[PDB]
Ligand binder design. Structure first.
Ligand SMILES: CC(=O)N[C@@H]1[C@@H](O)[C@H](O[C@@H]2O[C@H](CO)[C@H](O)[C@H](O[C@@H]3O[C@H](CO)[C@@H](O[C@@H]4O[C@H](CO[C@]5(C(=O)O)C[C@H](O)[C@@H](NC(C)=O)[C@H]([C@H](O)[C@H](O)CO)O5)[C@H](O)[C@H](O)[C@H]4O)[C@H](O)[C@H]3NC(C)=O)[C@H]2O)[C@@H](CO)O[C@H]1O
Ligand SMILES: CC(=O)N[C@@H]1[C@@H](O)[C@H](O[C@@H]2O[C@H](CO)[C@H](O)[C@H](O[C@@H]3O[C@H](CO)[C@@H](O[C@@H]4O[C@H](CO[C@]5(C(=O)O)C[C@H](O)[C@@H](NC(C)=O)[C@H]([C@H](O)[C@H](O)CO)O5)[C@H](O)[C@H](O)[C@H]4O)[C@H](O)[C@H]3NC(C)=O)[C@H]2O)[C@@H](CO)O[C@H]1O
Ligand SMILES: CC(=O)N[C@@H]1[C@@H](O)[C@H](O[C@@H]2O[C@H](CO)[C@H](O)[C@H](O[C@@H]3O[C@H](CO)[C@@H](O[C@@H]4O[C@H](CO[C@]5(C(=O)O)C[C@H](O)[C@@H](NC(C)=O)[C@H]([C@H](O)[C@H](O)CO)O5)[C@H](O)[C@H](O)[C@H]4O)[C@H](O)[C@H]3NC(C)=O)[C@H]2O)[C@@H](CO)O[C@H]1O
Ligand SMILES: *[C@@H]1O[C@H](CO)[C@@H](O[C@@H]2O[C@H](CO)[C@@H](O[C@@H]3O[C@H](CO[C@H]4O[C@H](CO)[C@@H](O)[C@H](O)[C@@H]4O)[C@@H](O)[C@H](O[C@H]4O[C@H](CO)[C@@H](O)[C@H](O)[C@@H]4O)[C@@H]3O)[C@H](O)[C@H]2NC(C)=O)[C@H](O)[C@H]1NC(C)=O
Ligand SMILES: *[C@@H]1O[C@H](CO)[C@@H](O[C@@H]2O[C@H](CO)[C@@H](O[C@@H]3O[C@H](CO[C@H]4O[C@H](CO)[C@@H](O)[C@H](O)[C@@H]4O)[C@@H](O)[C@H](O[C@H]4O[C@H](CO)[C@@H](O)[C@H](O)[C@@H]4O)[C@@H]3O)[C@H](O)[C@H]2NC(C)=O)[C@H](O)[C@H]1NC(C)=O
Ligand SMILES: *[C@@H]1O[C@H](CO)[C@@H](O[C@@H]2O[C@H](CO)[C@@H](O[C@@H]3O[C@H](CO[C@H]4O[C@H](CO)[C@@H](O)[C@H](O)[C@@H]4O)[C@@H](O)[C@H](O[C@H]4O[C@H](CO)[C@@H](O)[C@H](O)[C@@H]4O)[C@@H]3O)[C@H](O)[C@H]2NC(C)=O)[C@H](O)[C@H]1NC(C)=O
Ligand SMILES: *[C@@H]1O[C@H](CO)[C@@H](O[C@@H]2O[C@H](CO)[C@@H](O[C@@H]3O[C@H](CO)[C@@H](O)[C@H](O)[C@@H]3O)[C@H](O)[C@H]2NC(C)=O)[C@H](O)[C@H]1NC(C)=O
Ligand SMILES: *[C@@H]1O[C@H](CO)[C@@H](O[C@@H]2O[C@H](CO)[C@@H](O[C@@H]3O[C@H](CO)[C@@H](O)[C@H](O)[C@@H]3O)[C@H](O)[C@H]2NC(C)=O)[C@H](O)[C@H]1NC(C)=O
Ligand SMILES: *[C@@H]1O[C@H](CO)[C@@H](O[C@@H]2O[C@H](CO)[C@@H](O[C@@H]3O[C@H](CO)[C@@H](O)[C@H](O)[C@@H]3O)[C@H](O)[C@H]2NC(C)=O)[C@H](O)[C@H]1NC(C)=O
Ligand SMILES: *[C@@H]1O[C@H](CO)[C@@H](O)[C@H](O)[C@H]1NC(C)=O
Ligand SMILES: *[C@@H]1O[C@H](CO)[C@@H](O)[C@H](O)[C@H]1NC(C)=O
Ligand SMILES: *[C@@H]1O[C@H](CO)[C@@H](O)[C@H](O)[C@H]1NC(C)=O
Ligand SMILES: *[C@@H]1O[C@H](CO)[C@@H](O)[C@H](O)[C@H]1NC(C)=O
Lengths: 173, 317, 317, 173, 173, 317
């Protein structure tokens, strides 16, 4: 949420995108299409897997400890045994609560960050040939067929090829 | 005409609610549970060496109650004590019971070595109807009830050196008779006095004659004591009556052994984490099954669920 | 000409300094305190059931010191012990005092039930000038000082079954006389021996004759002991002298009761969190009033202030 | 601070804005005015209230514990009682210190984020009709009366209406 | 990493920049040069020093405690002493692990933030006289000698001086 | 032509790997270590007052073993006990040894004041060959072995008031003879009984005659006890034999003193943090040298290294 893309300037997500977490939809003279972006998808996945690697399958071995249940009333020593255990459990319970809250805030933020980074990268690539419509969409001011859209998604788009055409379309009356 | 190019992200129809720093309920595309909250209900017999106590407490297996003869010299990683267990020998108590139980549990062995104590002058191998072994009157297998020989109980002053490279654990006891007459019938003189010592330590116990409520028709009691003897030290037993003598020593080891109270069945399966409710998987970092654990276990917490987001915010169409 | 449109944010003339990860002093527009550092100085009498001990310790209220007759059978969530409290009966001690105090505090009741013990053969209801009740020589209300009857003290062998569905707490004692002569004047024979037992437990205590420094002109002492008797078990008392006998049993309950030392006045007010300094509000998560607390309380910390930002960075004009 | 708006490219805050936390000042042919932005203000407030909801009014009930003050010298058992309590208090004191430091860093960052998001939203809305002066202000290159400024603040500004006028003003010599 | 500049749109760092952490390289008619930016460098350093100030030289005094090693077997009381200590050490070990992980994530993010802020500041300063090439470089569309480059780095660049020249170069065919 | 202006950041040829929330290995330009993992191996003699026990345990220095006469009346912040230390006086034990050691360690002083006890009727200053001081048979310097005078040991009933403004610590003992004959040779009557009391407390100890394994050719033992006497209270000692009497009292103080077991040499250097391995620097917040510490010390953790990034991500050319 802190970057402002997911649940922000992108109005909603796409339930029909099932082969990636981030990607591109377009409309041009040949149709309307969708493609996932693998680099951004993998960047978010790698970070989340990094968190999981630090939490799953990581337990601590303990053997003989203290007694934690008691059949008879005893007073001072038993009060201390019970208090040590209750103290420990409350501290671990706090750690668990805070860990999940912090990690989840961070996951929401890092996923929003990856959406924003992809948007910014695309904006810069288009140079003077497009304008940002404010909703995560760019209006591209030149004929941009399927191979042209592909070049944008693959990072091989040469803005100079189309610049004269685009400037003419943008700065007309 | 030109073109439109839109950047976006996925969403799912079935999102999951998680907590964050700023919101107690936010929907994400996917999450994973971090608290283990279930067991199958069986204690897996692998990979830890499990010893099911069945009818026997550890202390009854130690002393040698007749239901526990099968336990002699056994070792364990985890001794499992059942709530149904009961004593069926001479009525006894252990001052500091909890500590003896703990130290034997932690040692992880009932390995016992007989020794030849010089009990010249008294009758050995005293038995009772409160401790039946094969219909015959019997007694604790690891203890030796000494009585008068021909109406004499001469003072005992018996020694046993530790010439081993390890520590020895001796278990012994004092008999408290129910009446002044019983004192005489057993030991031929007025109430004794026991002193068990080493170069490093000393314990003296006074028998206290008197009626206790009957258990298996016995108003007398035995009180159990223990002594650890280091290498090159010497056990000295000094008594004029009422001694329940050791027959030898237990080895005392150090390691990862313990004891647990549970009524869970032992299963033929493999699990690293044991609780009294049964073994639990240990993939998750936390668990709310039981504060009592043994092995590689998730840490006990009060929460029954903690969901870790594994996807972005879910923003459905 | 056109126009100018400027984006901005508020600021305040009176910002507050907070700590962050990268700066120990940064000014924000607003903050809130997370450490409770004050009390009004009164212990609120609601919503917890408070019992002000006034001149009495819990143990004096238990045994029945004459200043504590008003406490009979009372219950509490929190028993409040005052520093001015003093004993004004026969001088006594309690081996393990801390444990008896704790277990009665936790039980939360002084509910007492009289029982008819068969004390045939001795004089009951012994009293002393060290324990005045209404100008008359008296004794602890819950204890029964037994002495010789016609210069005979026959052996006591007295039983009391627990046929209730709950546990019974028995409080009893041994009298240690100041001189050999006092032993004879009270019990008609040489120093006794007390054995109190059940099917599960046994305690024997030896009176020790000798001078202790005088307290209310008494060089003798009483030593207090306790025994818990489970349902279907039986109390057995076996003595030839020096027994300070129980008159009955206390109910022993489990729940949320405790005890606190404090000189704070009790007030007619409502507060969930009690400390020895008085009740404190419990809106904040932390407090630095006292490590000793009872009820729904903030957690004790060493810091006297922790400010949580509730606004943006303050950037004044 | 991490987004760079508050205490960054916005030179300072406005003491005279008392009906919101974020907003707009303008100058046009009809005067100089100020208006709060309620959406951004509420977004920051909601997040801070979310933190407060997790910290205020949330205490734990404890009843019989261990003794923590002692009238007599005793040795081993008392040493252990004292150590358990000192251990507990130091761990809770650490938790409290870190909680406040982390939460405060986050509050400063999230409030800066909301200022940046409002700025970015406004920038995109203006399309080719304005330029960013670098200090959180936009130079709008067309006549923009009170209703026009209002349309920007309400999200109803139609950039196409003014584009010819604006481009003429921007790209003149 | 979360801002996308360092290890992101900036392809790599400069081993030859030894007098600052962030800065500028240029090419113009007089040569190719490098200069550090002191403000951004100091901003990152100050934040990292703030963390260090809260961690280094801050120890807690403890005196008489409990015993932690034992020559003889004892049972219940010793089991409790050992458990209290093992409990304490595991909680402090957790605190240390999490502290370093969180602080390091934050340091990487705050340093990336400072790089991004400097880039954004420079972009705004250049107004319509330059275009972002996508790799942290700007193509400046006017003659920009050493004093001109200096004015950009010192914040004294007057975009109006060069605007006519720049627009002519940008929007030609 | 125009110009190009590129924004960038530094990098280094020799980066360092750190851990983060999302990556266990990321290279940064610089880092600093947060765990202290080394010591020089010396305990610095400044700024804490160090007392090297040399051949003496604290308890031997207290009682006055002949190797420990140099320790009289010394104070410490930290008493250092060496593994080579051994006792070389009359064989003794201390029920609760750990507690006496702890309370003296914490008090931080061996300040002793002699008092004139009225021991009329007995022989004082008994000595033994098991406790050599300058080739002569001797005894613990702070204890007074009382024996018969002209084959009489009349009952002792000796008082000592505390008219000071501070508490007094009395150390005393009971002699357990090896044989019935030794009892007679020393005390002229059958086995005694010791009662040490105040207005607030009482302790009675029974000598137990019997053979223990010989230590320096002594089959007898002494058992050591202690009593704290508050201002305006009174010590009363009541015995008919076997008393090892106090010669006076120790001052008992409160403060920051302690005791540590270590074989590290004491060095002429200055360090605030002491461990058994030696002093350690205390700049870092954590350490993995030893869980045992004294002074201003980093907190013990299990990790041997924790690197804190102090620079950006390193992205080499
Ligand atoms: C030639 C001549 O004149 N010889 C003299 C002998 O008469 C005399 O021997 C004593 O004689 C008396 C009768 O006057 C009596 O028989 C003595 O034996 C005791 O008998 C009582 C009463 O029956 C008995 O008490 C009962 O005990 C049972 C249970 O008994 C056992 C048990 O636990 O199973 C039997 C065990 O073998 C015994 N253990 C050992 C090691 O001996 C134990 C043990 O005595 C108790 O557990 C201790 O409390 O008891 C049940 O408890 C009943 O309720 C209870 O009434 C005693 O148990 C018998 N004692 C013994 C030692 O056998 C008999 O000794 C002799 C001595 O004065 O003098 C000669 O000159
Ligand atoms: C016909 C015939 O010849 N009969 C014989 C009797 O003479 C004889 O009785 C005994 O006679 C002697 C005198 O030779 C003496 O009077 C015995 O009574 C004791 O007296 C002493 C000295 O006065 C007294 O000691 C003093 O005690 C007080 C405080 O006293 C109380 C108290 O605490 O308030 C009074 C209580 O009633 C009493 N409690 C009970 C249950 O009896 C207690 C208790 O004795 C003590 O607290 C225990 O330490 O004491 C104060 O402490 C003074 O400083 C102290 O000197 C004793 O208290 C008296 N003892 C009793 C039991 O009353 C008297 O018994 C008889 C016995 O040998 O033999 C006949 O044949
Ligand atoms: C005129 C007349 O007829 N007078 C009578 C006396 O004869 C009689 O005196 C007693 O006589 C017997 C012999 O029949 C004997 O000598 C008694 O003295 C004891 O002797 C034994 C045997 O030698 C001895 O035991 C040995 O002790 C040593 C070590 O000894 C010391 C020590 O620890 O160094 C010496 C110390 O001075 C002593 N301490 C004190 C305060 O006296 C201690 C202490 O006795 C022990 O540590 C306690 O265990 O011992 C070693 O341990 C040997 O292995 C061991 O055999 C005793 O130590 C001697 N006891 C004493 C008190 O000196 C002698 O008393 C008299 C009494 O019946 O009656 C007259 O009528
Ligand atoms: C929502 O988010 C979660 C977390 O990221 C995803 O859950 C992971 O899903 C993957 C793919 O299904 C799982 O990968 C598999 O792990 C198995 C191990 O399972 C046990 O062990 C772990 C820890 O020890 C436990 O956490 C787990 O619950 C199990 O008890 C492997 O055996 C699997 O191997 C098989 O597939 C691979 C394919 O490469 C082959 O190499 C093998 O031959 C074999 O056939 C597999 O690797 C992973 O365990 C899940 N993690 C967790 C924490 O649950 C969800 O998939 C995701 N949901 C959606 C809709 O995206
Ligand atoms: C600086 O930042 C802080 C924190 O955000 C703001 O403090 C909050 O201010 C609001 C508005 O004044 C407070 O709201 C009121 O709460 C009362 C409860 O007070 C007690 O209980 C809580 C917790 O149980 C304690 O934290 C608190 O200290 C008190 O002991 C309610 O009784 C009030 O109700 C009244 O107003 C509402 C209006 O809708 C009506 O519904 C009712 O009829 C009633 O008349 C009210 O809801 C809030 O408690 C404050 N929070 C804290 C944590 O202190 C400051 O306002 C802010 N300062 C500035 C200048 O902005
Ligand atoms: C990688 O990152 C680290 C951490 O930021 C840098 O380490 C710091 O480096 C500076 C400069 O060298 C150090 O500053 C010096 O500190 C000395 C104190 O040293 C001891 O005390 C501290 C804590 O009490 C310990 O952490 C430390 O290890 C030492 O035991 C001062 O004595 C120095 O003073 C001298 O220089 C100053 C210059 O202004 C003068 O005022 C004095 O006259 C005097 O001559 C100096 O201040 C700092 O201690 C280091 N911190 C840490 C935590 O180690 C690395 O420099 C950095 N590496 C690179 C390549 O950038
Ligand atoms: C002191 O009092 C106790 C309690 O009254 C006495 O114990 C009781 O003694 C009687 C008589 O021996 C016991 O009776 C026996 O019961 C068994 C079991 O049912 C039965 O098989 C026998 O036939 C016999 O009747 C009774 O069980 C026992 N009660 C308890 C609670 O132990 C004790 O004997 C008295 N002691 C002395 C020395 O007087
Ligand atoms: C053993 O020694 C102690 C201590 O000296 C003796 O106790 C003391 O005994 C005297 C004489 O009985 C007590 O005197 C009394 O004092 C009270 C109170 O002021 C007064 O009212 C009486 O008139 C009487 O004089 C003294 O208080 C008491 N001291 C202490 C500290 O208790 C003890 O009697 C001796 N025991 C034996 C058996 O010899
Ligand atoms: C009870 O039994 C113990 C153990 O057998 C007896 O202790 C032993 O007594 C003998 C004879 O006095 C001691 O011999 C002495 O050894 C020393 C040291 O080498 C030597 O210098 C003497 O010449 C003498 O031969 C032996 O050390 C001792 N053993 C132990 C383990 O203490 C004890 O005397 C018996 N007690 C009674 C009252 O019968
Ligand atoms: C110890 O044994 C000796 C020698 O047989 C004997 O004199 C003594 O009475 C015994 N002591 C006890 C307490 O039984
Ligand atoms: C600033 O002043 C107002 C009005 O006097 C007050 O309500 C508010 O709490 C103050 N804020 C701070 C941060 O002190
Ligand atoms: C217990 O009571 C019995 C029977 O009255 C008696 O013989 C015995 O002496 C008593 N025991 C004690 C220790 O008082
Ligand atoms: C205490 O001293 C008195 C008076 O001298 C004496 O009668 C008594 O026997 C002594 N008590 C003991 C236990 O030694």
């Amino acid at each position: 949420g802190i970057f402002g893309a997911i649940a922000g300037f992108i109005e909603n997500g796409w339930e029909g995108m099932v082969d990636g977490w981030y990607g591109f939809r377009h409309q041009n003279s040949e149709g309307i299409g969708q493609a996932a972006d693998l680099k951004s998808t993998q960047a978010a996945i790698d970070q989340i897997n990094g968190k999981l690697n630090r939490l799953i399958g990581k337990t601590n071995e303990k053997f003989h400890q203290i007694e934690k249940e008691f059949s008879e009333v005893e007073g001072r020593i038993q009060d201390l045994e019970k208090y040590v255990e209750d103290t420990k459990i409350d501290l671990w319970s706090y750690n668990a609560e805070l860990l999940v809250a912090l990690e989840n805030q961070h996951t929401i933020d890092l996923t929003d960050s990856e959406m924003n980074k992809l948007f910014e990268k695309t904006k810069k690539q288009l140079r003077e040939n497009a304008e940002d419509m404010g909703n995560g969409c760019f209006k591209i001011y030149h004929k941009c067929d399927n191979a042209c859209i592909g070049s944008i998604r693959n990072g091989t788009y040469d803005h100079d090829v189309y610049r004269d055409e685009a400037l003419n379309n943008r700065f007309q009356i | 005409p030109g073109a439109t190019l839109c950047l976006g992200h996925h969403a799912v129809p079935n999102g999951t609610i998680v907590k964050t720093i700023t919101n107690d309920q936010i929907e994400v595309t996917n999450a994973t549970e971090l608290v283990q909250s279930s067991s199958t209900g069986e204690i897996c017999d692998s990979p830890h060496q499990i010893l099911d106590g069945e009818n026997c407490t550890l202390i009854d297996a130690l002393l040698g109650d007749p239901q526990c003869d099968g336990f002699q010299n056994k070792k364990w990683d985890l001794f499992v004590e059942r709530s149904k267990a009961y004593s069926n020998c001479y009525p006894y108590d252990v001052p500091d019971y909890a500590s003896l139980r703990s130290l034997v549990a932690s040692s992880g062995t009932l390995e016992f070595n007989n020794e030849s104590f010089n009990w010249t002058g008294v009758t050995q191998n005293g038995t009772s109807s409160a401790c039946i072994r094969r219909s015959n009157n019997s007694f604790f297998s690891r203890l030796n009830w000494l009585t008068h020989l021909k109406f004499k109980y001469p003072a005992l002053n018996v020694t046993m050196p530790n010439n081993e490279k390890f520590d020895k654990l001796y278990i012994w006891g004092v008999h408290h008779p129910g009446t002044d007459n019983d004192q005489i019938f057993l030991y031929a003189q007025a109430s004794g006095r026991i002193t068990v010592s080493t170069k490093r330590s000393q314990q003296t116990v006074i028998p206290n004659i008197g009626s206790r409520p009957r258990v298996r028709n016995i108003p007398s009691r035995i009180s159990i004591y223990w002594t650890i003897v280091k290498p090159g030290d010497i056990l000295l037993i000094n008594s004029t009556g009422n001694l329940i003598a050791p027959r030898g020593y237990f080895k005392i080891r150090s390691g990862k052994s313990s004891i647990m109270r549970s009524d869970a069945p032992i299963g033929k399966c493999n699990s690293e984490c044991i609780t009294p409710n049964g073994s639990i998987p240990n993939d998750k970092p936390f668990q709310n099954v039981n504060r009592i654990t043994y092995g590689a276990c998730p840490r006990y917490v009060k929460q029954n669920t903690l969901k870790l987001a594994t996807g972005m915010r879910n923003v459905p169409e």
